Amino acid sequence: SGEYPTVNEIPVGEVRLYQIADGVWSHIATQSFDGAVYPSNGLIVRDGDELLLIDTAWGAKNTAALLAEIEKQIGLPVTRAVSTHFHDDRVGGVDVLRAAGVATYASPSTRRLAEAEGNEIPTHSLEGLSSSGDAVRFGPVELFYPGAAHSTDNLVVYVPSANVLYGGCAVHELSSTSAGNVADADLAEWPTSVERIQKHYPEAEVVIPGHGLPGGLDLLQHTANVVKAHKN
Numbered sequence: 001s002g003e004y005p006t007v008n009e010i011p012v013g014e015v016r017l018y019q020i021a022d023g024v025w026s027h028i029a030t031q032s033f034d035g036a037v038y039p040s041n042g043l044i045v046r047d048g049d050e051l052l053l054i055d056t057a058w059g060a061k062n063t064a065a066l067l068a069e070i071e072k073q074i075g076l077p078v079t080r081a082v083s084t085h086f087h088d089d090r091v092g093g094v095d096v097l098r099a100a101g102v103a104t105y106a107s108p109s110t111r112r113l114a115e116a117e118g119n120e121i122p123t124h125s126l127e128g129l130s131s132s133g134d135a136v137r138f139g140p141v142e143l144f145y146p147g148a149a150h151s152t153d154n155l156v157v158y159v160p161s162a163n164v165l166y167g168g169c170a171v172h173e174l175s176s177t178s179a180g181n182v183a184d185a186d187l188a189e190w191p192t193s194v195e196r197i198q199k200h201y202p203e204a205e206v207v208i209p210g211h212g213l214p215g216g217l218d219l220l221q222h223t224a225n226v227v228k229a230h231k232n
């Protein structure tokens, strides 16, 4: 159909790519957790004759499959990866990346939390992101720390060439009916963090959530709405 691929269409272990814009893809994979199956997204951004990866494919074997799919579909080497928070859907697979020549990065907050939780740990620390509203450049993207939301360390990623906003797990898809896995969330700060994203990226054309279908800037307001209803 060429439509964005949904949880039931992706067996656990296989990875899909979806072209978002020129030089921008999402990657989609599925994983089992606590007896249910979930999709999750990441991003790929062309960086000259190399690629920048945002987030793993949620597990070691999924991430190996991601690398194979990139080779098949794109054929440029992944040289760097950024993980946007410490959960396994973002860092699970960092060891696979590190053994495939990829330099792995995350904020110091993410690295601390990953280490404390027993999740895989990116090698390199991203300074300059410790206060909400902070932004830094990283190859063809901007990394932005909006404040605590889904997690206290969550980062969002903007692709200025294409006006693509990758919200990661701080942003939910339009069909969502709850705020996802909130165990490490700050439901009270989340709307404020989303407002910071809205103010900083008003020209975003595509908004990609951490899980589920991309859309437009409405994903941000919807996220605030579902989080408020969850807190309530």
Ligand SMILES: C[C@H](OC(=O)c1ccc(CN)cc1)c1cccc2c(-c3ccc(CS(C)(=O)=O)c(Cl)c3)c(C(=O)O)[nH]c12
Pocket: 033, 038, 087, 088, 089, 117, 150, 169, 172, 173, 175, 176, 177, 178, 179, 180, 181, 182, 183, 184, 210, 211
């Ligand atoms: C890998 C990730 O682990 C955690 O978070 C986690 C938190 C604490 C512990 C305890 N040490 C362990 C693991 C995770 C595991 C399993 C599921 C998720 C979901 C998710 C996403 C969407 C929906 C549909 S929705 C919006 O309509 O609710 C749902 Cl149900 C869940 C999300 C997310 O929200 O980012 N992260 C998910």
Ligand SMILES: [Zn+2]
Pocket: 085, 087, 089, 150, 151, 169
């Ligand atoms: Zn998470």
Ligand SMILES: [Zn+2]
Pocket: 087, 089, 169, 210, 211
């Ligand atoms: Zn998530």
